Design a protein around this ligand. Structure first.
Ligand code: FAD
Ligand code: FAD
Ligand code: LYS
Ligand code: LYS
Lengths: 583, 583
């Protein structure tokens, strides 16, 4: 039979194993071996240290599956709309296939977020009469979205940028229009060779950029990423659609991928196993044969016996690839081998994304204190439309965004009310990291060896809780001393995605890359080594996808490999929806 | 005889060799072997790719030693005052011993810097007339220095913090006063377990922090480093003294260390060799015996045969130590060895500093355009503190500070006029890095393999030059369209210190560390490993010193090792000058 070896039981790896079995590529007698460094709870309460999988982690208050929860990783999806060809098609199809469509609910955001900017409190609808305190004439009386759309249109000009295919084409062929007005960037410049922040800064000045970075929505990415992709993903014609979540958490999707793959494997006679607490240590090729070593979670740097497979999936992000590549980079490898991850073209293409650090603080309260009548600046979570919403509130602080989940349980547990506090960006990673150790304690774990998110959300220190409460007091009262009015959380925990093995909350395409060429060619890295024998060793996950903010991109890269390198029939309608960009 | 093996011919490694020979520790029949990854010009024109050494690099315009220059790395020092016992003692003694004291000149800074903040132009002397555009009442009418001094006093209370000894003791034992007024931090908290930015932000709010970060002097430092050390180094009572530089460049210190060591070694019968384009690849211990491999610069990841020495100095910063540790971390090491750099206590103490990325753009103009009579906001380089000065101009832009060196040429007929543009901090690294590749081109070198500073200042792209001129136009004209008024530079080059092998402009002691214990014990890392045989393997350099901004710290740690582990008589008077903190 045929053995399929998957390293990483995150979304991409789990989706791959589920498609191989349910799509009927793995037949009776075949083997699927999934290896996961972490110890996720696939088999109910007590079967792991946190719910699955990777950067998706639903966290229930007190670890009570009947309680309110906060998504401590990825939190929402965009429902596929086939009449518009927009939304997370594989996520929507997979939820339906797993029998979970009945649990899909709206994730509603306020039309009138509170903005806390340079010590001013401005509800977004009021900007026409209370201009934002940024020296950016015109733009400061409009939501930041108006400035995003304006900058996008200065970059895209008259180019069609409405469909997914047109957007893909702009990544490679998009040029600044003949009308581009700049001292720095000539008209006709290749937009994919421009940094988004660099050109936003050129066109709107530091105050226009800072206003957009401080007051913009969650989904508009202002880091210095590929300007071609940034323009089409932040503009008027950016992909959109209805935001949804899975009632009871996103993690159940990954529990069901695993359990349904195992039930289908039993019916098909396929040997499907998950081996947790076990990492890929090193990988290399001998012609088409993938050689690899495993390491235990207890001793992650020491490899075991050399194993072989004809089919290997590296279902793991850049920082995780880096740790595997480090294990052979400096080694004296066997004669006739190819140290594939350290080949020059593979290392170059792996740098086709930049990294954004993220930290999430999850706080449960015994009452929804933010709704009290005497709160000076409450979040506007009701009407402004009709349904109830989760916020956010948006600020120029380290605590850059707040979501208010409240009691999102089925109502049978003792009511707790959840708040998600978001810290992001290179600017702030060093700010938040020192809050992770108690003020009475020295650091004990070397930072690059603290695999905190891999194990599960970590108890918030008293310093971290107090800092969050200070920032929420400034947001909702305008007085740091009001932190005394906020009740102490009944539970507070954090996920710091900058730590290994994740090394990032998010990846974004880099400037000075041909995005489509990286998306196409990085998946089978032997293609980036001139003269190499093809091998079925693949790189999959959201990082080198066309949907980097989303589980969708993990599923799409995995699907693209099954289609292109295993000849499988896709479950998607790709007519108007390329899984990854073509060049 | 006795062999001394030094890895890294930066300031620390060169100083070590010089002291070993000129102090008479190495005697006739001994050997000193220095290995350097780079290829520095120690022997005049044609002898390397840039002037020595490490993060000190004088850059002459057009590679003309008679032209104006700009320090493309470290630029100034504090002259030792033995009467007050204040300043950079070893740097001053070394310049004197090398015969370079007659090249020492004042490095003067304006007492009335131009501030460009949130699109407003304010000369610092006029903040009473035109308050800084930050919502920080009182603080915004005073120089940022006042706020720095106020915060330091809130942290230090009545603790004496004027002497090196007392500053060292504050790192380990210093506590917030009983009067500390904070929601986040209790009175009496250990200041060394607090992040400086965390507590600044707590006490002064985001607008007070942002004003200090944007408008503070060059030496001011708001990163989230150890609050005990930050309070005593940012306070009214920070280490002071008269700022100087070496006319003709700081690099000639390092040329002269090498040449004079070689001459002295030849007179003494010591074999002194510098082998460049050759790096330490891997290091480990067998009892007291230092085992190592070298790699060529051409093939930096492939080690040669195992070599041994009894005396080894790792004269290289954290990111450089990290690359050497990576080469054994994942290896199956020989029987009876100690993989010293990957020992738990060594890895923990190596994380006792955080890193600050820095980028320097050096621009030479054919005329001092900033002095022209029609310039709306010229720098006040002439009068206010009596003699002429180099600036700076201070801004809230990515281009955070400007220095104006002008014509410092020594005998050209066609002098040029130099400008130093500084970009720093984790916030901006991704902003400046995309300017490093031409707008017509894709990236070609993997970012972690682009050893740019090692080679030498790189030609600025046209996009980088235009960005700097745009920022200088906004600063000096308040009109981005005035960029057309600035003459195109004769030469523009950059040094990005975030790149390997440096991985930082600067290191700063971290929160949640006992600074003194790390300073003392990291130097001989076998002392951090229970059961290990002691070995003469040392870690030296600025990063784990008590003078992290400065060459002084490289010399002090190197001096401390020669005194503590080789029984050498110090050249310093340590009466009021501990080389490193004592515990
Ligand atoms: C703060 C945050 C918010 C998000 N919000 C959303 C959202 O609202 N909706 C959404 O759809 N997406 C969201 N995402 C993105 C989503 O989390 C990712 O797209 C998705 O988790 C990517 O899946 P992946 O399988 O590619 O990688 P990962 O989730 O990173 O999984 C990789 C797996 O590989 C394992 N691994 C690593 N190294 C090894 C090794 N050597 N051997 C074996 N196993 C290894 C890891 O432990 C992990 O389990 C968010 C992400 C973050 C961080
Ligand atoms: C922007 C900037 C401004 C500064 N301003 C000042 C200032 O005004 N005044 C001042 O006094 N100081 C200043 N400094 C600091 C000064 O540059 C440093 O303190 C000093 O260079 C540190 O010397 P070092 O020997 O510890 O390390 P480095 O200068 O980093 O030298 C280490 C050496 O080790 C080599 N190396 C690395 N890995 C290996 C390997 N595996 N094998 C062999 N060799 C290896 C490197 O190539 C390098 O030559 C500044 C620094 C920067 C970046
Ligand atoms: N995926 C993140 C942010 C959205 C980014 C979209 N560009 C979340 O919804 O939690
Ligand atoms: N080395 C700097 C001092 C500050 C460095 C730390 N950011 C100088 O030239 O004065």
């Amino acid at each position: 039979g045929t053995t399929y070896t998957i390293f990483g039981a995150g979304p991409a790896g789990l989706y791959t194993a589920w498609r191989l079995v349910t799509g009927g590529k793995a037949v009776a007698g075949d083997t699927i071996q999934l290896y996961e460094w972490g110890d996720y709870a696939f088999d109910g309460p007590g079967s792991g240290t946190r719910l699955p999988a990777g950067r998706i982690v639903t966290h229930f208050c007190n670890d009570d599956p009947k309680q309110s929860y906060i998504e401590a990783g990825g939190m929402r999806f965009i429902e596929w709309d086939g009449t518009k060809s927009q939304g997370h098609q594989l996520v929507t199809l997979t939820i339906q296939a797993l029998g979970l469509s009945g649990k899909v609910i709206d994730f509603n955001t306020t039309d009138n977020p509170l903005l806390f900017l340079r010590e001013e409190h401005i509800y977004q609808n009021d900007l026409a009469t209370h201009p934002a305190p940024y020296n950016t004439p015109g733009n400061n009386e409009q939501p930041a979205a108006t400035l995003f759309s304006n900058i996008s249109a200065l970059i895209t000009g008259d180019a069609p940028v409405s469909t997914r295919t047109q957007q893909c084409a702009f990544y490679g062929s998009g040029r600044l229009p003949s009308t581009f007005n700049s001292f720095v960037y000539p008209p006709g410049s290749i937009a994919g060779n421009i940094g988004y922040w660099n050109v936003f800064y050129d066109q709107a000045g530091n105050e226009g950029y800072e206003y957009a970075a401080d007051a913009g929505g969650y989904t508009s990415n202002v880091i210095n990423w590929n300007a071609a992709n940034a323009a089409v993903y932040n503009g008027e014609f950016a992909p959109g659609g209805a935001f949804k979540t899975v009632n009871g958490g996103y993690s159940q999707v990954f529990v069901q991928l695993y359990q349904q793959t195992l039930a289908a494997a039993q019916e098909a006679g396929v040997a499907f196993t998950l081996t947790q607490r076990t990492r890929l240590h090193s990988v290399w090729l001998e012609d088409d044969v993938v050689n690899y070593r495993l390491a235990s979670a207890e001793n992650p740097f020491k490899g075991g016996a050399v194993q072989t497979t004809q089919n290997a999936f590296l279902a793991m992000p850049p920082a995780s690839l880096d740790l595997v590549a480090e294990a052979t980079r400096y080694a004296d490898m066997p004669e006739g081998t190819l140290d594939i991850l350290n080949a020059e073209g593979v290392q170059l293409y792996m740098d086709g994304v930049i990294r954004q650090p993220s930290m999430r603080v999850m706080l449960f309260f015994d009452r929804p204190w933010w709704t009290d009548a005497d709160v000076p600046y409450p979040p506007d979570l009701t009407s402004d439309g009709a349904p109830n919403t989760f916020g956010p509130t948006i600020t120029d602080l380290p605590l850059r965004q707040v979501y208010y989940f409240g009691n999102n349980s089925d109502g049978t547990a003792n009511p707790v009310y959840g708040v998600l506090a978001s810290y992001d960006d290179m600017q702030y990673v060093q700010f938040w990291q020192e809050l992770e150790i108690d003020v009475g304690e020295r650091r004990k774990v070397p930072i690059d060896q603290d695999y905190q998110v891999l194990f599960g959300p970590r108890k918030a220190t008293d310093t971290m809780i107090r800092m969050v409460l200070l920032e929420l007091a400034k947001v909702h009262w305008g007085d740091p001393n009001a932190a005394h009015q906020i009740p102490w959380p009944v539970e507070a925990i954090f996920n710091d995605f900058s730590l290994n093995p994740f090394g990032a909350g998010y990846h974004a395409w880099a400037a000075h890359y041909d995005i489509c060429d990286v998306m196409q060619r990085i998946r089978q890295p032997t293609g980036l080594v001139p003269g190499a024998t093809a091998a079925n060793l693949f790189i999959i996950g959201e990082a080198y996808s066309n949907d980097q903010a989303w589980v969708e991109g993990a599923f799409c890269t995995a699907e693209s490999v099954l289609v292109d390198y295993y000849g499988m029939t896709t479950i998607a309608d790709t007519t108007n929806y390329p899984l990854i960009c073509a060049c």
